[model samples]
Target chain A: GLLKESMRIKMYMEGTVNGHYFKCEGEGDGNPFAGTQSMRIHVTEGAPLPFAFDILAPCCSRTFVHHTAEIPDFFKQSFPEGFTWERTTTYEDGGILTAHQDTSLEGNCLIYKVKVLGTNFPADGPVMKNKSGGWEPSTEVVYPENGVLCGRNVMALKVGDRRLICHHYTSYRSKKAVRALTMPGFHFTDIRLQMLRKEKDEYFELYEASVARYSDLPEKA
Target chain B: GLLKESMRIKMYMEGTVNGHYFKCEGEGDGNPFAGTQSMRIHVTEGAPLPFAFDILAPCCSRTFVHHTAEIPDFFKQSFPEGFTWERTTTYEDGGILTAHQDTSLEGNCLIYKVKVLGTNFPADGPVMKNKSGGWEPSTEVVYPENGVLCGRNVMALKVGDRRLICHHYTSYRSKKAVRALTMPGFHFTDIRLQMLRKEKDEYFELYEASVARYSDLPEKA
Candidate 1:
């Protein structure tokens, strides 16, 4: 019973967001590895509707880091036993955000620092490839504190071959917090899945009877 | 940036599906206490769409489980490393599903197996109590390969003052899973997270500025 409307598994996708070519509609329970955040993408028709991409592990449990891409330093192993890095830049109203800590990709891979909100972005161009793969647009359209036309433009959406590393944060919603969504545009907010593959499955019959029988044991453990 | 339409923690619920009062939307990236699958439940109105409800240890790495409600023998202390308990029933067509495992609440807590999908459910009745309370309805329905109306009755939506033990897998899609919602129904798929309390956040500001100041230390240990 993969929610059978004839066997379902909506972990579907199409790709090319920001550059365009849309149909995302992803985020699963259509049985990817059986049940997870399924990773969200939302565009359903090329583009337009308040985007909240989030691939595998953009923390906040936006989860989907199945296995094999073990980039676990878990904050250098656990700094203060809980380890934490702070570079927050949210001037609130009109907007301003920062999370920098790249240190040249660090010991293995942490890069960290995702603040996307582009609008004519592109200071010069060609500095997008941190590691993942393609589709790098939102460019670098910041206004934060330099404010005027308001804010929002955080984009990194890479899907070269589903390398998928999203960290899109641009929404004029958080400063106080209550909750209410209508939908308009650029709301990626956050996402990260280094190695996500569940591209699409109208229903391979619940991922061949519950996601290929145990996915991959965390990339062979 | 909790996907802020108003600083969203999505964990905003109301309950009464099939009876009708609806609005179950929750979970997000809270530094991931490390993430626990945000525990999703749709039906902002009363059922109709594609249906995606996954809980506990799934994806997005959305995790937050503080103590006091400890129940973990670790599935019998890793019955094979990953450890798992059983009671799985899944016939095709209309429906049929089950999962009953709760050994008095053990060590690290792993009462995993969330597949809520009830329609007019209620085979026997009364036993739907654990914590995180609310809307038990599916009653306790079962088919076990006989009869017709089929199966799927998984419920446990504790908000009875917000204990929030959500494992509702039954919503052929009630709100924005692609818009096709009607009303009056049951549909759960997967769920978990024993004592989840990533409840509110006015923005610790994206986990104290992008998680951890140290950000490392575990590998060499």
Candidate 2:
């Protein structure tokens, strides 16, 4: 069977925030925030190819700031009387940070690198053991900020197994407060591979056609 | 003239990635590299709405990475001798990233935000500067990943007033990279807002009905 003109393509992606949103009851402000965010991408046939391509290119490259609910009164007391609350507001106090892409593009993948230079507080939490036999923290509370880089690719392959290659690198610098708190600062990088399959009707149709052609009666030989 | 079932709604969004592509000139590598990336979202309805309070939402988001040319010598110096080049292949050392959204519900106005946390090589280039003011740098650049998040409530908001709210934030940490790079990094966040409007025909027809009702009133009320 030949491919139909109306054959459409649909793409969807889902990711977790890595940590669940905590429901703080005895905090200064008890506002509930979403613990995770998810994203979805849909591409259909005849919808401009470049348009859909751009939308699905970068799958998980994003950064977020998860603020702490309880700051010690001693820190707040350290500020002068005239210190406007607005100045203490998130953005002015370095609440808004940014990410970067070095050379812009590399091979079929786009490269991105990032570092968390400074944060308002030190990283703290209870060290506990997890099912993996490693000592994990009860809660990993990042200071003011975190860094992340996401690489993306839009591919069209012949019917069969497919793989997507992704690289993520993250690094953080010790802030003055962190250094004072005797916290151990560190850096990290990782490479992730995503596998995909072309299991659509069109893919099976192509497989059937190839099988039929190969199975046809062979000439005497 | 009251709330009716004849109102229709439509929306539009646009995005752009600006950069160029460069190829390794000296090497035998025939692959070309990308220099810039951009995207846009455009949607419209040519007909009037069939009902009032008709909601149409179009959510658009993206996450992408820019990788660097593999530095064979750097890897050799960092790792032990007899280190397989295959292990440090260009793709393996590349960056990975992705970004999208979970919600696509339409409202009276649309909003968006943009955040960038890392950078690749060639950080001092014009493209990088245009995205963010010259900031900190890392070979695996971190901080200030430059990008934009632009959207509006209505596709055709009064000619020169198409500006909408954009919420931009940045982060610099990740839990999965503790072993990879042994460091925390940063990335960008962009949220856009778009406004939807009822089809013009629907609006005018309703207006006509209101006018017709008044036409039956006394001449000198």
Candidate 3:
């Protein structure tokens, strides 16, 4: 035989995603884990080890996509008129990769190249430029504007006679569960992953990994 | 000399995007625009041609976008509980392009492969798929969602759990006094194109161009 039993990393975390707010319940097989209306809530506890929760939702972008047919009202009816956010990420060794959004953006349209606030969130070698030609960071380069919460990005949808240069704030989802948010067109008043724990079970220390955050900042775009 | 007197397509639109709605009453050169509180507008006029109004709010992608950080109350503060929509696209020549939301999606998320009901709408090919995977005729494929008052794209803030899946819907801007909704997101309660005609000095034909609409479908997105 091999040797003695060694401890593996096991942790707990929960927060809303796509507003798919998840409150980890006790381990179960019955009622199971789910979001409002059983929308797509992917991170369930005790499902996997070395696992983490993932969240995705648009906050801002730069491109002008989508049909503005009902976009004007869509914003009025679907997203917050404006929002303020803060983002922080972690690295494998437990160091941090971070950024924050203390500004605002449209509910439907957004911007690109948001500012990253983490001391660890290094740039893309100081020479990387986003599609909109902004000083893109590693996050902007690896993620979409407001890009890639787990899969992602942002943009326009105001109205005729009036143009909206919507921005985007991107996010990410990497572990814990393996589900996906399928509904489209949603936004957040605020999204914060500003903190993540690196605790682990006995003998098993938690270690986070590389991460990213894309933001919105539109200039003459 | 290859000089000519041409009235190129010039336009300005304003509206909040992602929620950053901006107001424009004409700033510089009687053609003013701004945002960051009322951040819901863009100055995409006199930009280019062959150039159409591209709607890129939320069409060409998979999965749901937008955040739930404030997503929960964001809905309460902003969007309706839910709504149903039907998407229809057409040829620039005015025959018809079609599809519908016979299928349901997330509350605010909608879908359609719209056809510009304009009399001049041209098309792509018979087997071309749009970013949102909709069947494209012509301009719809080339424009943004809300792109042609209709057309294109997702989120995870709708991108980085630090959610990279923050998907986005792209948009565009164009000119034309006569047209029907052309993108996938055009199925709102009232997506009318307002102030498209500012009034002419003498008599200008308002020669509308061929438009298009790309749709984001969430059947299995």
Candidate 4:
């Protein structure tokens, strides 16, 4: 067998809390498909963080997501059983919102401003989207590009196109037993479809088909 | 894990009636004792058939004797119990007996003459002798070597200075269920041994030890 090599993309999120900045980074391989790449953002009462970004040539489209949580017995039985969720703090009170940039783009880098709202009190809810005015509910939540909820809402923004997608949502309720609640959300902001050209053909088709089929299916009888 | 090659050795015996000669042939590879090789032989009535001559290379002092009878029950109980024997015959015979040739002197290519004794009846008791002139009552008797009861003994002169050591004894009884009023007298004419070299120190030592131990055991028991 021949060895294989490929390029990748890395995204960094930084925010300020109590006048101090803290940063965390997530990386993804260039292959949109057939490649497992994603990031997780944990915001706890913290400082403003500086962010870094990078992008490389698109290879394929495949993404992987790993999360841990406590699920209802019925849900667990209906799906894959015996699942566990990892405890992660997303935001805390006095958290900071710092600078954001896309390094994947060739030369001209795109920058975005982000803010970390109430944290520390166990932030749990659907990932909100910033409309022409304020944060509001969005249906664009999905994996890779969609929202993943562990402790707080995580939103991802495309490099050049400027589209934003909520990736994860997570929370903690029982501290003694150590349990978490997960509510996934998704959103697409300001970016054009052309920016995700490589991911369009198969990803979009499958996503659209899945959404259509989900909408058409009868609610749990 | 390393790849392992498997090897095996199988023995068989055949007898010829009238002008026909029968013997067994076996094929196998990956034997460290003897490199890849196949062997065949022509077996005559009342003669010890020497097949798998290559085995002598490793078992320098050992001689193999083959018998064409039903598989011994003891061997069956000890090893593969379900093995069945098939009968086969060979008409071709006659080979030069080079029993006394020295491997060191011959450098590998050496042929010997084999004397064919015309006899159908087995021999009476015979004496086993070493090159040193010491003789003992052989526990078993071979054909032409012991001479037919009705005729002169067949004399097959050996060519080398190597002393022959009695190793294994083999004989075949009738397949039909019949009691013998007298010991079925079988002849052992084609007594054979590979021309071993004096340089075979290890083989000589092992054979000497084995023969010494064999002699110590209760002869009848």
Isolated chain B TM-score per model: 0.23, 0.19, 0.18, 0.19
Worst 10 residues of 1 chain A by lDDT: A203-212
RMSD list, candidates in order:
25.9, 29.7, 22.3, 36.3
lDDT of 3 at B142: 19
How far is B212's C-alpha from truth in model 3 (Å)? 32
List the lowest-lDDT window of 10 residues for candidate 4 chain A.
A204-213
In angstroms, what RMSD does candidate 4 have relative to the true structure? 36.3
Local accuracy of candidate 3 as per-residue lDDT tens digits, B58-131? 11111111221121111111122211223343222232222222111232332222212112222342212111
**Model 4 spans > 4 angstroms off:** A1-7, A18-20, A25-27, A38-104, A107-221, B1-221
User: Tens digit of lDDT per residue, candidate 2, span B1-221?
Assistant: 21122222222322111111111000001001121212222222322222111111212211112223231111112111111100000111121111222211123211222111122212233232322111111112123111111211112111123321212221222222223332212322121222222234222110100000112235775
What C-alpha RMSD does candidate 2 show over the true interface residues after superposing them? 15.0
The sequence of per-residue lDDT tens digits that candidate 4 reaches over residues B27-140 is: 222222211222323232333422222212222211122223321221112111111111111111222121111111022211112222122211221111112222111112
Candidate ranking (lDDT, best to worst): 1, 3, 4, 2
Model 4 chain B — which ten-residue stretch has the worst lDDT?
B205-214
The CA-based lDDT of model 2 is what? Answer: 0.19
Please report how far candidate 4 places residue A87 from its true position, in Å: 21
> Candidate 3: how large is its RMSD?
22.3
Taking the true A–B contacts (Cα pairs closer than 8 Å), what share appears in each candidate?
0.00, 0.07, 0.08, 0.00
The C-alpha TM-scores of every prediction are: 0.19, 0.18, 0.19, 0.17
Selected candidate, larger TM-score, 1 vs 2:
1
Ranking by TM-score: 3, 1, 2, 4
| C-alpha DockQ of every model | 0.01, 0.04, 0.05, 0.00
